[PDB]
Amino acid sequence: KNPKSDKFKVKRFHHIEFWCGDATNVARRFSWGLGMRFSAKSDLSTGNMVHASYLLTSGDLRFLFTAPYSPSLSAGEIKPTTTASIPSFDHGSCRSFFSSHGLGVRAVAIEVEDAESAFSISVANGAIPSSPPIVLNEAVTIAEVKLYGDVVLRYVSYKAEFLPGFERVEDASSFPLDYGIRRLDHAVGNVPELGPALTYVAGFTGFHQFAEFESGLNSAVLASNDEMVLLPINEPVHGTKRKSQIQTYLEHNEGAGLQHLALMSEDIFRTLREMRKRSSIGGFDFMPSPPPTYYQNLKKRVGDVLSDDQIKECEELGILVDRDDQGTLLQIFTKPLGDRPTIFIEIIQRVGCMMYQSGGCGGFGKGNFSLLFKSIEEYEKT
């Protein structure tokens, strides 16, 4: 059931912003590892004396990497005279964030009809304000409220090209990499207490719970009206056999924060071929693959959806497969993106639920906990 209770008009995920110590090195690493093009910048060369911000794009996916300059470059500025292109940016906040959490997501940005209205309605409905609505060049409005931990939900609305003050990138510096990634499917937070986190976010958005179907977690998914903005939240389950990965996250992250970004591919086979080729030459590593018993067991579960060759391709790439009552999910997880065992990336492709494809088709793979455990002792039984 979907009561379509959004308190303001929400469109799609717009961008994800990482707060970095050095935006250049993280952006270049991510560009090569994920096949994303350098498409916009705001930095010293564009007159920004406050922060360096670099935008990578792949299809509709937008990753922004931002780091602070020395405060001395802008010590004469005040907010009315700022050269920052993102007016919510604060040197102290950014340094405190990265010192506390390491490299990670500061902002989950969604595009809305009216960011000023979204901010006002959110705050009237319990949202903790983080940065008030600000109109940029009479063309774009940005506002921010707290989501969880030090992560903010950023509202962006356009009157009618990323943000004013950003410049399109050089072409020589813009190599057209593309491994098939096309959009953000969902963005997942880890918190100590799921109940109060859900109540808070659902309280100020009107997002509804997305229906599902002990591994150390309890989770729930909040969804917009058309279920294209999907914000799952996890809490740890304590006392289990193996220590909860959610608890490890909270310890190494110094509390709640964004756990994973799931990136939809239009061809997950190509994406994983291209990413795995680059794992050991600057790109991303992937978790250890399931045993061959898992891919043996795929015939009975999804043999009506994938051929033997397509299943063999999944086995070659370490891809996981789950199924809803509506659709099928192909997914795989990277190792952590940086030094800490905190944020990682999921690559996904969904098949089914054709109307366009409806959001969340096939679920989020919670069935793969049983099937992985079921595969593990099965391969031990050889």
Next chain:
Amino acid sequence: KNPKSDKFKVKRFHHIEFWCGDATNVARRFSWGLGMRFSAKSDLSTGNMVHASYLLTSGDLRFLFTAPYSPSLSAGEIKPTTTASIPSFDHGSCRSFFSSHGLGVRAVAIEVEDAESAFSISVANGAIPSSPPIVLNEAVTIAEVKLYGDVVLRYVSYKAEFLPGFERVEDASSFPLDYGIRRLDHAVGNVPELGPALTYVAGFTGFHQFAEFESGLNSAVLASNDEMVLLPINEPVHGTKRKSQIQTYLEHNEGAGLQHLALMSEDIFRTLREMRKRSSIGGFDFMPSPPPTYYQNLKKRVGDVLSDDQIKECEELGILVDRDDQGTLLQIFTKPLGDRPTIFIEIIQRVGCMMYQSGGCGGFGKGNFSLLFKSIEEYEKT
């Protein structure tokens, strides 16, 4: 003239350590951009609860990338019980360094006969101590004194594999990249006042001035007995037509620090081919090339050293050429390595001064200031 006045036995450059906010992303970027292999690690997976440290190697060149974890992971430790593999590491120092300077070199490490003796003699001769000698697993001794700004000169001595507590890397994660870089040729600092910086460092090392042959700088080079450890220092020259690049460095870096690392290649043509192929796909960018008049003028200057084809190869790659009374230098400069216009890399190859090749053969390229200016108006004169 070389008075060979070293106050302790110095061998060669040993490693360069960058202090990072996220060591993983910088190390992976540098590995791909420079063709260096991942060869050792010290991090959570090796029992280090304090810092993540990753070592890249190319030939004898060793780049170490280090970032701090949350202090909470090690809050129960004291120095006698530390799990840090580099005992001089301090969370607060590292965070303060990166917040002040951004990504940059913390340590220039040289191998010595006896790091305890080098430390004692240095401090008795005016060196400001930074970290006292500490013996690691009864096998290696490390000590540190201040060099300039927040950069330290690190002494390392071995009784008889990088450092104890580091583990050799996985092989699957160790891709054998190699673009031809083989060793560190020199490491250059920028300071506000050259005189007092030279007096200080030469005072405690016994390093002697290396002889040379207004562009915004004055410089001088300090050298070990066999002139294989070379430590140039620059100061700005104020009031010039174009603003001094040394002054821009000092402003954006928040004071003195390491300006550039010069990396010797055994085949600078191959190195630059390989690095330029990767500039726009995660690697490093190079400064704009000199005009063709520069390569025209190369025939009269070095036509006895390089063929027309070899000169044409220099022009294809943007390589600069200078000449001493003893040797010839091929060199090129990267754009800044990170967000700030501070640290950059030089790639070099030297030809001549055969005995092995003597250190500093061909100088450091100061002649290229005249020849570049001479080339610029010449190409304007077309």
